[PDB]
């Protein structure tokens, strides 16, 4: 006769490129039977600037992967890398060339600009030289969405009518995913084939690829049609779940809990409304399940808050025929669109923050604001102009004040006077800074609920709140990005999040000039002081494709990624 | 246009049979949106002597399926279901009919005596006739074993041989999986196709379905082959993962800890002996792994233990080797190619580990050895004490050996082999499933194979017992405190698999004897369900499970209780 594993590279096992075969830039030291501990792993920089990846890895990791993992490799390329252990009281090292083979888009059409997608460094400051940065895009499938759910006929539907559809199968993209560091260089790929296939019609390998985050335990959850995963950075799935069969259509987000949970945002299938019209809802619809799958808690947003309210959504621009205002009409088909009512794109919701101080939730719903919601299923406040608020959610909306405390007048549609205070519209990523904040992506579509005179006059903000729950205050106490107009306007999608070691405000606009038709979409990656406001870091991604939205980015670091 | 779902059946949703497609006998009431509170399952019994069953429903479980679960239908029958719940402050209740299919076993050729397994209930003492058991069993495949691991040349072998074989990839076959009640009924069927597919050559299909065990959630674990899994009782696949890289071959055990770990016991793959010659070894290691397929710790009991002991090894019948020879005293080699075969050193089955229990007072572990008998180990991976015939014991491990007392505390005197004098003090030998009880005593199945470490002078001369030894850590001493079977004899005489559980519901010892009458020839083997009253040894349950095929051995079964499936 047969043939032989291959025989060790050092003083352990072989080393193997890509052992799980979904991470063509990783490799693994095999233990062959070693025992042994305080292992350190570095990569090397590629050329005179290249940047240096290093860290140590942990006990489990070594169990699990019978090996040392690799992680920061260049492609095509022959990496050098050091790894240093312990064994038998005495210490040792290796270096090891790896090669590496080559980074492939299988989804490229006469819409493609080239096979990947561009970096462009811009600003990196000294003392930043070693972060790296998971970019979460995707591209452009050949034929787009190709498959709907089936839905429910209606009593006004034509007699001789084909059935309806319902849901948002077509909610359906290509992955594009990988790490980025200071020099625009690839130094991470999942393999497209890992989770997604385009090509063929199996709908567990469908969906849009999202709501990356780290878990406790250095991994990532993520969640993609109609299933949600766990993996690491070895290209290893650790877990992989169908969704509940009462629920569907997962995107957006997902975060593990310190309880063992985790959080998803979905829509409930078969729903059945007052009208006894059966659709599957859209995104109004949050999880709590567990490592088994199973269903600990569901919060009904539709039985939450007002699916009726059409204050923000009534003004929004409908290129998200681009521009123009949102026109909404009462016969709306139910679906993936925006319309009140379940079964319609009422809500939007983006993003989940778990609130352990109070086991509550915290959530931003596009098209109506941000809220948190309590275990019992209470609205707890409410931060939104109070336009189209009704009783008894109105109770609940927060009071602006200022440094003192003090009332700032603004109007139902959030227009402030006299300060700086603003809401947030079509906002994203409301989560909570480990400073004991809450941090929001201001998208700023529909700011004010009302579009304005010209397109290139909409910004995006980056916006930190100080909340007093048990007064209903809220209070503006930072925000960047107001300054620097259609350049730094991203519409859509987008993240930011509070960096205490080097106290910088994280962002990543994922949708930067969307709108320049034939032009590729802009993903900028930002570090910005939060002493100064100076720019830290700045890097672009350009799409592959024009005019096709990056969703969110993460500040990865290597020390935690291998416990 | 399109064809509609089905349309509610009662005051909620349609009724579902089998949702998920791996159970058969289980249906599901669709919630259809509908808020409900207090719910209850009632399945009335089949005929006049039919066994009812009722279970609540938990709000996760409805919420988990979208619906009420139903278990516990009878296969090819309209079964008369009951359901009850509060919805909107008032009392609700609907009455389904819900038909049923049939049981398939996809595993047949002409051994078959029949397609299915049969049942003889033999004794059934008042108040125990609800009762339900979970068997889990097995059936031979048609080709049997058909794929072997690679393994490493070594020197000794010639020079155009192709390579060796390593590991235990054979040990292969389709389960046969359903639970019984107190009329030898069958009122719950997991499909076959669930976990294995014996006609295609995907391994992830593969192995030999074990180590059934309940979790904290009233679901349930399992391993087979070089995967393990999660299930519930409505046939739902929860987890599925590979073992880690470095592993293979899992078996006999699988058990969710208070920890939500998992320990799961197996062999590792290219393990480097001193010689340099790499094997993957036999049931000698324990893992312990988190929900995400991770690894958290992991016992090495080559290293931990002795695999040159050969006190037991020897002394034993080369007729449960895997699959003429019966009786015959086990004859050591040294020469014996590494694989699953009886001998000495990593590589071959030198241990056989059957058994894990986690000892949550003081983080250690409790290891079966069928053929070294019952360790426990420490998170320290330091031995902490041995219960087996100190022959063959070198030090350190010698002086961990636990010391026979009576009920006063006094030396027992018990020779090298295990034979004691002036008491009813037995070790145990070959034994299985050495798990914590209720009371915090440890319960053991002592198959009886090899014991006093010879073979007896004529092959019927084998008795099992139900045994249960009560430990003191702190001075080495261990006491005998129960046991039962030792006067049934041979007919009550399981070599291999099988299992003790101690249930202070009833205060009853429950116990399945998976491998009885497993060499007569041409005959069925019986898998023996029972309950003993702890008090009075009196038999309150008895009953028998036959093969489908002959001398085709059952693992194990367990004493399910529906209050307890969904949570």
Not at 133 to 152: K, M, P
Not at 233 to 247: A, I, S, T, Y
Not at 367 to 395: M, N, Y
């Amino acid at each position: 006769a047969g043939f032989k594993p291959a025989p060790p590279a050092g003083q352990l096992g072989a080393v193997i490129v890509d052992p799980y075969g979904n991470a063509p830039l990783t490799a693994l030291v095999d233990l062959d039977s070693h025992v042994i501990s305080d292992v350190k792993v570095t990569v090397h920089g590629k050329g005179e600037k290249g940047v240096e990846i290093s860290y140590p890895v942990g006990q489990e990791s070594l169990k699990t992967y019978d090996g040392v993992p690799i992680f920061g490799l260049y492609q095509k390329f022959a990496n050098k890398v050091t790894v240093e252990w312990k064994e038998n009281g005495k210490v040792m090292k290796d270096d090891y060339v790896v090669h590496t083979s080559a980074i492939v888009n299988n989804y490229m059409d006469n819409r493609s600009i080239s096979d990947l997608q561009q970096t462009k460094v811009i600003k990196v400051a000294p003392g930043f030289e070693d972060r790296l940065y998971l970019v979460n895009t995707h591209t452009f499938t050949a034929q787009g969405s190709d498959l709907h759910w089936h839905g429910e006929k209606d009593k006004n539907a034509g007699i001789l009518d084909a059935g309806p559809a319902t849901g948002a199968l077509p909610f359906d993209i290509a992955p594009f995913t990988f790490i980025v560091d200071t020099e625009g260089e690839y130094r991470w790929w999942l393999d497209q084939d890992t989770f997604y296939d385009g090509r063929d019609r199996d709908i567990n390998k469908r969906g849009y690829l999202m709501g990356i985050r780290e878990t406790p335990r250095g991994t990532f959850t993520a969640v993609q049609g109609q299933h949600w995963y766990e993996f690491d950075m070895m290209g290893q799935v650790l877990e992989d779940h169908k969704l509940p069969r009462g629920f569907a259509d997962a995107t957006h987000e997902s975060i593990e809990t310190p309880n063992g949970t985790v959080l998803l945002r979905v829509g409930k299938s078969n729903y059945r409304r007052d009208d006894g019209v059966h659709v599957t809802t859209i995104r109004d619809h949050i999880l709590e399940v567990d490592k088994s799958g199973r269903v600990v808690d569901v919060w009904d947003l539709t039985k939450i808050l007002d699916p009726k309210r059409d204050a923000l959504l009534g003004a929004l621009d409908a290129g998200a025929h681009a521009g123009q205002q949102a026109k909404l009409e009462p016969d709306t088909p139910f679906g993936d669109a925006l319309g009140v009512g379940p079964g319609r794109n009422w809500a939007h919701v983006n993003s989940i923050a778990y609130d352990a101080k109070d086991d509550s939730i915290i959530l931003s719903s596009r098209h109506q604001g941000v809220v948190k919601i309590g275990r019992d299923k209470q609205v707890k406040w409410i931060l939104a102009p109070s336009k189209g608020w009704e009783k008894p959610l109105a109770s609940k909306l927060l009071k602006p004040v200022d440094a003192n405390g003090k009332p700032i007048t603004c109007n139902e549609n959030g227009l402030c006077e006299n300060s700086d205070f603003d809401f947030t519209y079509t906002q994203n990523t409301a989560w909570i800074s480990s400073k004991g904040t809450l941090t929001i992506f201001d998208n700023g579509d529909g700011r004010h609920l009302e579009q304005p005179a010209l397109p290139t006059m909409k910004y995006s903000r980056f916006v930190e709140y100080k909340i007093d729950e048990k007064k209903g205050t809220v209070q503006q106490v930072w925000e960047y990005g107001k300054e620097r107009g259609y350049d730094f306007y991203s519409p859509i999608t987008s993240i930011i999040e509070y960096q205490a070691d080097r106290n910088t405000m994280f962002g990543f606009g994922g949708s930067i000039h969307l709108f320049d038709v034939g032009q590729p979409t802009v993903g900028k990656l930002n570090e910005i002081d939060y002493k100064t406001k100076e720019v830290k870091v700045e890097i672009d991604v350009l799409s592959d494709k024009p005019n096709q939205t990056h969703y969110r980015a993460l500040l990865v670091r290597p020390q935690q990624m291998f416990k």
